[PDB]
C-alpha cells in the first residue's frame, strides 16, 4: 500500500473523489462534511448543516454540485463553488445510507433504512420514483455505469437488481401531455410500474452492506455481515453467484471492483483492507490498521487512487507504483509497458514493441538500465520484502517484429538494484548491501564491500554513485575508492546531463545540482513531491513535480514553466517540446 | 530540533 | 522603490501572468496582485484563490473577475497576522474559458513567505532575569550551526542582524581569540512575546584556520510558534551565507 | 378556469426550461440542455396554461411535430446573445409556422438573455426572424431575462389577452 494522504477526524462514513480536481469529500459521523485537497494535503472547506451522521456523499461528474444524505432524513444538494446548500430533498422516513448522482440524467439515487430506494430529480427538486421491495434497511444502492440498471444491497440478506428503463422513457418522452396528475397522495401501494426488480440475488447468510457493478462486465460484487465477499454474474434473464472470497473475520462494510484491473478491493470492520484476484478469488494483499475499523471504500474514476474511511479518519492510497520504468539514450526511449519492452524514436515518433518480458513477476518493473553497446537491458523488480528483490538481464533482439515481439530468455537473479558500469559489465547491489560486478553472462567478476550503501546509480564508465542515509558518494569501482561526497538525504533519482558535466540529484522534496566532481552548484527545495527531470540541450534542468513543469539553471535560478493536470515523467527535452511518459506508460509530447 | 524539556525546574515552574 | 517588494507569482508561458506587491503592515499584510490575461480568450470567473499557513487569516476572499483578451486587472487581498509565526501564503488563479475545451483551468502561484523579523524587536534584561526566563520557558528549539563563516564574531554579528535580537553578553566577555564563544540574546515581539537565545559556538582547531564555525544555537520561548519561527529563520539565514 | 395548451420551443441553450421553472417555482433552475420535454401548468389571470417545454437539440427538433396537435399558443424562445444560430432559429421557426396544425396558434417570441451585454435587442431579433413577413398570424416579441424574470409576465399577459379574445 502506498499511502498518499491521511486525515485524522471523526469516523468517516462516506467518501467521494472529484473527477477532475485533486479533491476528496469526506462525510463524518459528527454531521460534518470535509472537502480536502489530497495533493496539497490541505482542508479546503467544511460543511456542517447536517443534524447528525452523514453517510451518503457523491460529487456530480460535470456540474459544480455534490449531494449528501444523513441520519437526519435529509438529502442536501450543494454547490461547492458557492459553498452553500442549494436545496434540501425531504421524503425519506429513516436514515439515508447512500446517495449517488446519475452519470447522464439529473437523478439522485438514495437508499434508506425506511426499506425504500428513491430516485430524485435534482433539477425539479421532486421524487420521481420510489423503489419498494426490500424487507429490511437498504444499505446501498448504485446506478449501473452504462445501463438503466440499479443494484441494491439490504440487511434482508438480498442483493436486488432493478430495471429503471421505464423511468427513462417516461421522463424523456417530449409528448408527455399536461395531464394534471395532481397525484400527491396516490402512493400506489402496488409497486410503481416504472422500475421493476430484474434479479433477486440470494446467497448471503446475513445482511448485505454493499453492492457494486463492474465498470465493463455484467458482474456485481457484494459484501455482507456473513464476512464474505460474493461475486455475481448477470444476464438479461438470470443472475447467479460466481464465487465467494473468504478471509474477512468481521462484517464486510464495502466491496468494489478495481476500475482498471481484475482485482476486487474489500474493507471490513476487522480493521483490514483486502485485495482479491478476481480470477483466482485468492487474497493478493491485506492491509491492516491496529485500532480503526473500515467503513467505506472509494475508487477515483480516472486515477489509480483509492480512499478508505475508518473510525479515526481517511486514507488515500495506491496499490501499485505507477512510475514507468524507462531509459533514454540519444534519440531512443526504451520503456516497459505491460509485458512488452517498447522502443520510441523521438525523431520519427515511431513506437514499437521490441521484446516480450518474462511472465510471472507479481511486481511491476521498478527501474531499467539500457546498454546501447550490447543492446542489453537490466530490469530491476523490487518485491515488498526488499531481500526478495530481483533483476532480469535481457538482450534486445535486432529483428524486432512489431506485431509478434520475440520473448528472449532473460537471466533472473537476486539483487536490490542492477546498473551498467562498463560496456560488458554491470554492478548489482546484493541483499547484503554488497556490490557485485557481473559480466553479460551474469557471472560475478568482482565483489566489493561498501559500507552503508542503500542504492546504486550510474556515474559514468567505471564510476557509481552510492546512496547512504544522508549522503551520495562518487565511487570508483576499479580503484575501490571514494572520489567525492555530497550531503543529501534519501536521493531517489540521478539524472546526468548529456555531456556528463552536470548531475541532478532528485530527492522527494529536494533537487541538488552538482558538477562532475559532486560540488553542489544549487539546491532547490520543493514543498510538492519531485517526480522526474531531464536536461535540455541548453544546460537547463527541466523537472516535474506533481503539479508543475519547472526549470532549474545551474546558478540556482528556478521557476514554473507550466501547470500539470496529471503527474508526468519527463524523458527528454528538445527545444519547445517536452517528451514524457504518463502514468499509463503513454508517450506524450508537451509544448 | 524541537524538544519538550521535562526537568525538575520546568515542572516546579509549571506547578508554581 | 515599490519595485523591491514586487514578487513574480507566475511565468510568462502561463495563460494568466500574475505578480504581487507585498506590503507588510504591523498587524496586516496587503497583497496587491496584478493579473494579466496573456490569451486571446475571454477568461470568465477569474478568481484568486488564496490559502494561508500559520497564524495568518484571510480577511476577505477575492471576488471573481472577467478578463477580456489580453486585458489586465489588480486584485487586492488582505491577510491578518494574529501571532508572531512564520506565515506562508499559497494561491491559485482559477478561470473558466467560454466555449474552448481548454484543459487548463488553474495557474498555480509561487509561495509568498512572510518574514517573522518584521515582528521582532531587540530587548534588554538583567542576567538574573535572563537565567530565570531561560529556566522557566517551556519550548526550546536547538539549531545546529552550519555556516561557511570562519570568524566567531562575524558569525555572531550576522545572527544578531538576521534575528533582530540584542546581545546581552558584554563585549569584554566576547573579547580575545580563543576559538570559543558563548552569548545570550534577547528579543521581544510587538505582541509582547519574549524570545531568548543562547549561542554556543567554537572554531574546530583540528580542521585548520579556514574551518567554518561550528556549534549550537538554542532558542527558548513560551510559545511553540515563536521558538519554531526563530529557529527556521536562523537556519535559512545560515544557508544563504553558505553561497 | 380556461385551460390553454402552449408549446414552448426553440434552439438548445435558449433558456426554455429556465423560463418554465421561473414561472412555476419562482426560482432559477440551473438547467443542462433539455434532452426531452417538461410539462407544467402555470395559472395566470384565471387561465390555466399547460406549457410544453420541448428540447431544442438537433436530434429532438424532428419530434416537435408530435406536439403541434391541439396547440393554441406557440412560445418561441431565442437566445438573443447567440448571433451565429439566429438564422437557424429563423429557419426552424418558419418550418414550424408552415405546418397546418399550427395555423391558428398565437405566436409569442421571447428574446431571452437580454441581461447579456452582446444580446441582440428585440427589434434586431424581429428583423432577423422575419416576424414582419408573417401574415394572418398574431405575434408578439418580448425582451426577457429568464434569470431575473423580467419581461416574462408581460409576455404572459399579452398571450392571455390574445387567447381570451380568440373565442
From Swiss-Prot, chain A:
<comment type="function">
    <text>Xenin stimulates exocrine pancreatic secretion. It inhibits pentagastrin-stimulated secretion of acid, to induce exocrine pancreatic secretion and to affect small and large intestinal motility. In the gut, xenin interacts with the neurotensin receptor.</text>
</comment>
<feature type="repeat" description="WD 4">
    <location>
        <begin position="133"/>
        <end position="163"/>
    </location>
</feature>
<feature type="repeat" description="WD 3">
    <location>
        <begin position="91"/>
        <end position="121"/>
    </location>
</feature>
<feature type="repeat" description="WD 1">
    <location>
        <begin position="7"/>
        <end position="37"/>
    </location>
</feature>
<comment type="subunit">
    <text>Oligomeric complex that consists of at least the alpha, beta, beta', gamma, delta, epsilon and zeta subunits. Interacts with SCYL1. Interacts with JAGN1. Interacts with TMEM41B. Interacts with SVEP1. Probably interacts with PEX11A.</text>
</comment>
<feature type="repeat" description="WD 5">
    <location>
        <begin position="203"/>
        <end position="233"/>
    </location>
</feature>
<feature type="modified residue" description="Phosphothreonine">
    <location>
        <position position="185"/>
    </location>
</feature>
<feature type="modified residue" description="Phosphoserine">
    <location>
        <position position="173"/>
    </location>
</feature>
<protein>
    <recommendedName>
        <fullName>Coatomer subunit alpha</fullName>
    </recommendedName>
</protein>
<feature type="repeat" description="WD 2">
    <location>
        <begin position="49"/>
        <end position="79"/>
    </location>
</feature>
<comment type="function">
    <text>The coatomer is a cytosolic protein complex that binds to dilysine motifs and reversibly associates with Golgi non-clathrin-coated vesicles, which further mediate biosynthetic protein transport from the ER, via the Golgi up to the trans Golgi network. Coatomer complex is required for budding from Golgi membranes, and is essential for the retrograde Golgi-to-ER transport of dilysine-tagged proteins.</text>
</comment>
<feature type="modified residue" description="Phosphoserine">
    <location>
        <position position="402"/>
    </location>
</feature>
From Swiss-Prot, chain B:
<comment type="function">
    <text>Phosphatidylinositol-4-phosphate-binding protein that links Golgi membranes to the cytoskeleton and may participate in the tensile force required for vesicle budding from the Golgi. Thereby, may play a role in Golgi membrane trafficking and could indirectly give its flattened shape to the Golgi apparatus. May also bind to the coatomer to regulate Golgi membrane trafficking. May play a role in anterograde transport from the Golgi to the plasma membrane and regulate secretion.</text>
</comment>
<comment type="similarity">
    <text>Belongs to the GOLPH3/VPS74 family.</text>
</comment>
<protein>
    <recommendedName>
        <fullName>Golgi phosphoprotein 3</fullName>
    </recommendedName>
</protein>
<feature type="compositionally biased region" description="Basic and acidic residues">
    <location>
        <begin position="5"/>
        <end position="16"/>
    </location>
</feature>
<comment type="subunit">
    <text>Homodimer. Interacts with the coatomer complex. Interacts with MYO18A; the interaction is direct and may link Golgi membranes to the actin cytoskeleton. Interacts with GCNT1; may control its retention in the Golgi. Interacts with VPS35.</text>
</comment>
From Swiss-Prot, chain C:
<comment type="function">
    <text>The coatomer is a cytosolic protein complex that binds to dilysine motifs and reversibly associates with Golgi non-clathrin-coated vesicles, which further mediate biosynthetic protein transport from the ER, via the Golgi up to the trans Golgi network. Coatomer complex is required for budding from Golgi membranes, and is essential for the retrograde Golgi-to-ER transport of dilysine-tagged proteins.</text>
</comment>
<comment type="subunit">
    <text>Oligomeric complex that consists of at least the alpha, beta, beta', gamma, delta, epsilon and zeta subunits. Interacts with CAPN8. Interacts with SCYL1 and PRKCE. Interacts with COPG1. Interacts with ARF1 (myristoylated); this interaction is required for binding of COPB1 to Golgi membranes. Interacts (via trunk domain) with ARF1 (via switch I region); the interaction is direct. Interacts with KCNK2 (via N-terminus); this interaction increases the channel-mediated whole cell currents and promotes plasma membrane expression of KCNK2. Interacts with STX17. Interacts with TMEM115.</text>
</comment>
<protein>
    <recommendedName>
        <fullName>Coatomer subunit beta</fullName>
    </recommendedName>
</protein>
From Swiss-Prot, chain D:
<dbReference type="GO" id="GO:1990386">
    <property type="term" value="P:mitotic cleavage furrow ingression"/>
</dbReference>
<dbReference type="GO" id="GO:0031252">
    <property type="term" value="C:cell leading edge"/>
</dbReference>
<dbReference type="GO" id="GO:0098586">
    <property type="term" value="P:cellular response to virus"/>
</dbReference>
<dbReference type="GO" id="GO:0032991">
    <property type="term" value="C:protein-containing complex"/>
</dbReference>
<keyword id="KW-0007">Acetylation</keyword>
<dbReference type="GO" id="GO:0006878">
    <property type="term" value="P:intracellular copper ion homeostasis"/>
</dbReference>
<dbReference type="GO" id="GO:0070062">
    <property type="term" value="C:extracellular exosome"/>
</dbReference>
<dbReference type="GO" id="GO:0000287">
    <property type="term" value="F:magnesium ion binding"/>
</dbReference>
<dbReference type="GO" id="GO:0006886">
    <property type="term" value="P:intracellular protein transport"/>
</dbReference>
<dbReference type="GO" id="GO:0005925">
    <property type="term" value="C:focal adhesion"/>
</dbReference>
<comment type="function">
    <text>Small GTPase involved in protein trafficking between different compartments. Modulates vesicle budding and uncoating within the Golgi complex. In its GTP-bound form, triggers the recruitment of coatomer proteins to the Golgi membrane. The hydrolysis of ARF1-bound GTP, which is mediated by ARFGAPs proteins, is required for dissociation of coat proteins from Golgi membranes and vesicles.</text>
</comment>
<feature type="binding site">
    <location>
        <begin position="10"/>
        <end position="18"/>
    </location>
    <ligand>
        <name>GTP</name>
    </ligand>
</feature>
Amino acid at each position: 500500500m502506498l499511502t498518499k494522504f491521511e486525515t485524522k477526524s471523526a469516523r468517516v462514513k462516506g467518501l467521494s473523489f472529484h473527477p477532475k480536481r485533486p479533491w476528496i469529500l469526506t462525510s463524518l459521523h459528527n454531521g460534518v462534511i470535509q472537502l480536502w485537497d489530497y495533493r496539497m494535503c490541505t482542508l479546503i472547506d467544511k460543511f456542517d448543516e447536517h443534524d447528525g451522521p452523514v453517510r451518503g456523499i457523491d460529487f456530480h461528474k460535470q456540474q459544480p454540485l455534490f449531494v449528501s444524505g444523513g441520519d437526519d432524513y435529509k438529502i442536501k444538494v450543494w454547490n461547492y463553488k458557492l459553498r452553500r446548500c442549494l436545496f434540501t430533498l425531504l421524503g425519506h422516513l429513516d436514515y439515508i445510507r447512500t446517495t449517488f448522482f446519475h452519470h447522464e440524467y439529473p437523478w439522485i439515487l438514495s437508499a434508506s433504512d425506511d426499506q425504500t430506494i428513491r430516485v430524485w430529480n435534482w433539477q425539479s427538486r421532486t421524487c420521481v420514483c420510489v423503489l419498494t421491495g426490500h424487507n429490511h434497511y437498504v444499505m446501498c444502492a448504485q446506478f449501473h455505469p452504462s445501463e438503466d440498471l440499479v443494484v441494491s444491497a439490504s440487511l434482508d440478506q438480498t442483493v436486488r437488481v432493478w430495471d429503471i428503463s421505464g423511468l427513462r422513457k417516461k421522463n424523456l418522452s417530449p409528448g408527455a401531455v399536461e395531464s394534471d396528475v395532481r397525484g400527491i397522495t396516490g402512493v400506489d401501494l402496488f409497486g410503481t410500474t416504472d422500475a421493476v426488480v430484474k434479479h433477486v440475488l440470494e446467497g448471503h447468510d446475513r445482511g448485505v452492506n454493499w453492492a457494486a457493478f463492474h465498470p465493463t462486465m455484467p458482474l456485481i460484487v457484494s459484501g455482507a455481515d456473513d464476512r464474505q465477499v460474493k461475486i455475481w454474474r448477470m444476464n438479461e434473464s438470470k443472475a447467479w453467484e460466481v464465487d465467494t472470497c473468504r478471509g474477512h473475520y468481521n462484517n464486510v462494510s464495502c466491496a468494489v471492483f478495481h476500475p482498471r484491473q481484475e482485482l476486487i478491493l474489500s474493507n471490513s470492520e476487522d480493521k483490514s483492507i483486502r485485495v482479491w484476484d478476481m480470477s483466482k478469488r485468492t487474497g493478493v494483499q491485506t492491509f491492516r490498521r491496529d485500532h480503526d475499523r473500515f467503513w467505506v471504500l472509494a475508487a477515483h474514476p480516472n486515477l489509480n487512487l483509492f480512499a478508505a474511511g475508518h473510525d479515526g479518519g481517511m486514507i488515500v492510497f495506491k496499490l501499485e507504483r505507477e512510475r514507468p520504468a524507462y531509459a533514454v539514450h540519444g534519440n531512443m526511449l526504451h520503456y516497459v509497458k505491460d509485458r512488452f519492452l517498447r522502443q520510441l524514436d523521438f525523431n520519427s515518433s515511431k513506437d514499437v514493441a521490441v521484446m516480450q518480458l518474462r511472465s510471472g513477476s507479481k511486481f511491476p518493473v521498478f527501474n531499467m538500465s539500457y546498454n546501447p553497446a550490447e543492446n542489453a537491458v537490466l530490469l530491476c523488480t523490487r518485491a515488498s520484502n526488499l531481500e526478495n528483490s530481483t533483476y532480469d538481464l535481457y538482450t534486445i533482439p535486432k529483428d524486432a517484429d512489431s506485431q509478434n515481439p520475440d520473448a528472449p530468455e532473460g537471466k533472473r537473479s537476486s539483487g536490490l538494484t542492477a546498473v551498467w558500469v562498463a560496456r560488458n559489465r554491470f554492478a548489482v547491489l546484493d541483499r547484503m548491501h554488497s556490490l557485485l560486478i557481473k559480466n553479460l553472462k551474469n557471472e560475478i567478476t568482482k565483489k566489493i564491500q561498501v559500507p552503508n550503501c542503500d542504492e546504486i546509480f550510474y556515474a559514468g564508465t567505471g564510476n557509481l554513485l552510492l546512496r547512504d542515509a544522508d549522503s551520495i558518494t562518487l565511487f570508483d569501482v576499479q580503484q575501490k575508492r571514494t572520489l567525492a561526497s555530497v550531503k543529501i538525504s534519501k536521493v531517489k533519482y540521478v539524472i546526468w546531463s548529456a555531456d556528463m558535466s552536470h548531475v541532478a540529484l532528485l530527492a522527494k522534496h529536494a533537487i541538488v545540482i552538482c558538477n562532475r566532481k559532486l560540488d553542489a552548484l544549487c539546491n532547490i527545495h520543493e514543498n510538492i513531491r519531485v517526480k522526474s527531470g531531464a536536461w535540455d540541450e541548453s544546460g537547463v534542468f527541466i523537472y516535474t513535480t506533481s503539479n508543475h513543469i519547472k526549470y532549474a539553471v545551474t546558478t540556482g535560478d528556478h521557476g514554473i514553466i507550466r501547470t500539470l493536470d496529471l503527474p508526468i515523467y519527463v524523458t527528454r527535452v528538445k527545444g519547445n517540446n517536452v517528451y514524457c511518459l504518463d502514468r499509463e506508460c503513454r508517450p506524450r509530447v508537451l509544448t | 530540533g524541537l524538544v519538550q524539556r521535562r526537568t525538575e525546574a520546568s515542572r516546579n515552574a509549571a506547578d508554581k | 522603490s515599490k519595485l523591491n517588494k514586487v514578487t513574480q507569482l507566475t511565468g510568462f508561458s502561463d495563460p494568466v501572468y500574475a505578480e504581487a506587491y507585498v506590503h507588510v503592515n504591523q498587524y496586516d499584510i496587503v497583497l496587491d496582485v496584478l493579473v494579466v490575461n496573456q490569451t486571446s480568450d475571454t477568461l470568465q470567473n477569474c478568481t484568486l484563490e488564496l490559502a494561508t499557513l500559520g497564524d495568518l487569516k484571510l480577511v476577505e476572499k477575492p471576488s471573481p473577475l472577467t478578463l477580456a483578451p489580453h486585458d489586465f486587472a489588480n486584485i487586492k487581498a488582505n491577510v491578518k497576522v494574529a501571532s508572531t509565526e512564520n506565515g506562508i501564503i499559497f494561491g491559485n488563479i482559477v478561470y473558466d474559458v467560454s466555449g474552448a475545451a481548454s484543459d487548463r483551468n488553474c495557474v498555480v502561484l509561487s509561495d509568498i513567505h512572510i518574514d517573522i523579523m518584521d515582528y521582532i524587536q531587540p530587548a534588554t534584561c538583567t542576567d538574573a532575569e535572563f537565567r530565570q526566563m531561560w529556566a522557566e520557558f517551556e519550548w526550546e528549539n536547538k539549531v545546529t550551526v552550519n555556516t561557511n563563516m570562519t570568524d566567531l564574531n562575524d558569525y555572531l554579528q550576522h545572527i544578531l542582524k538576521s534575528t533582530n535580537m540584542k546581545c546581552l553578553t558584554p563585549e569584554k566577555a566576547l573579547s580575545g581569540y580563543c576559538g570559543f564563544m558563548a552569548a545570550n540574546l534577547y528579543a521581544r515581539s510587538i505582541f509582547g512575546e519574549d524570545a531568548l537565545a543562547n549561542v554556543s559556538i567554537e572554531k574546530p582547531v583540528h580542521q585548520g584556520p579556514d574551518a567554518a564555525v561550528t556549534g549550537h544555537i538554542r532558542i527558548r520561548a513560551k510559545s511553540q510558534g515563536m521558538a519554531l519561527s526563530l529557529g527556521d529563520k536562523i537556519n535559512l539565514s545560515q544557508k544563504k551565507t553558505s553561497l | 378556469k380556461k385551460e390553454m395548451r402552449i408549446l414552448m420551443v426553440g434552439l438548445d441553450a435558449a433558456g426554455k426550461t429556465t423560463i418554465l421553472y421561473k414561472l412555476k417555482l419562482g426560482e432559477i433552475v440551473t438547467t443542462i440542455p433539455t434532452i426531452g420535454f417538461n410539462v407544467e401548468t402555470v395559472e395566470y389571470k384565471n387561465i390555466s396554461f399547460t406549457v410544453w417545454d420541448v428540447g431544442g437539440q438537433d436530434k429532438i427538433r424532428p419530434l416537435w411535430r408530435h406536439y403541434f396537435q391541439n396547440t393554441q399558443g406557440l412560445i418561441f424562445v431565442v437566445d438573443s446573445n447567440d448571433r451565429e444560430r439566429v438564422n437557424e432559429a429563423r429557419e426552424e421557426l418558419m418550418r414550424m409556422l408552415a405546418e397546418d396544425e399550427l395555423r391558428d396558434a398565437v405566436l409569442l417570441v421571447f428574446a431571452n438573455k437580454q441581461d447579456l451585454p452582446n444580446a441582440m435587442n428585440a427589434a434586431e431579433i424581429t428583423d432577423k426572424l422575419g416576424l414582419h413577413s408573417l401574415r394572418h398570424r398574431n405575434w408578439y416579441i418580448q425582451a426577457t431575462c429568464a434569470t431575473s424574470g423580467d419581461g416574462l409576465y408581460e409576455g404572459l399577459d399579452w398571450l392571455s389577452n390574445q387567447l381570451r379574445n380568440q373565442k
